[PDB]
Design a binder for this molecule. Structure first.
Ligand SMILES: OCC[C@H](CO)Nc1ncnc2[nH]ccc12
Ligand SMILES: [Cl-]
Length: 167
């Protein structure tokens, strides 16, 4: 039993809800919140910009030190950093950004990072400003993640389409 509330069960382990991931994280304080990161951990907009703003820019400061030490992530890769005031940990995961010409096949590799954590709050990878089809991202999530994932979808119209079209 966990404290996630109001989710629709899609499979044994994947759940979905219309919600602002920032407001969800603040309420639940999950062990892990997933950020929709880029390789430079520059959290300027989308999920990343919103999560960082909610930390009063502490996420960005921590991320800049991470990059200075380790260099950029790989597309499809991840790193674990602090969750600040939102969660215990933040798993920064880089899905492919179609608007940069990045290979969508790397979306499965990105979701594989979730399997290293027993329970996660997350957005759909490569959706939004990363330009991929959110229906496809949900399919890859369901077919790749085996741990318990609670997906927050910000747009109510998109949420209803993902549910009504889900196979
Ligand atoms: O699930 C990823 C794609 C959705 C499309 O609505 N974007 C978001 N979902 C949840 N929380 C969010 N906060 C800021 C953006 C955002
Ligand atoms: Cl977005």
């Amino acid at each position: 039993v966990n404290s996630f509330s109001g989710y629709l069960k899609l499979t044994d382990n994947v759940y979905i809800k219309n919600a602002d991931i920032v407001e969800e994280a603040k309420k639940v304080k999950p062990t892990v919140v997933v950020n929709a990161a880029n390789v430079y951990l520059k959290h300027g907009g989308g999920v990343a910009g919103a999560l960082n703003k909610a930390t009063n820019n502490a996420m960005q400061v921590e991320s800049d030190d991470y990059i200075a030490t380790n260099g950029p992530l790989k597309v499809g890769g991840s790193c674990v950093l602090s969750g600040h005031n939102l969660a215990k940990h933040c798993l920064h995961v880089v899905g492919p950004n179609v608007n940069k010409g990045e290979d969508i096949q790397l979306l499965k590799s990105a979701y594989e990072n979730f399997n290293q954590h027993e329970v996660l709050l997350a957005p759909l990878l490569s959706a939004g400003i990363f330009g991929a089809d959110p229906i496809h991202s949900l399919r890859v999530c369901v077919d790749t993640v085996r741990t318990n994932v609670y997906l927050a979808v910000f747009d109510k119209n998109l949420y209803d389409k993902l549910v009504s079209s889900f196979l």
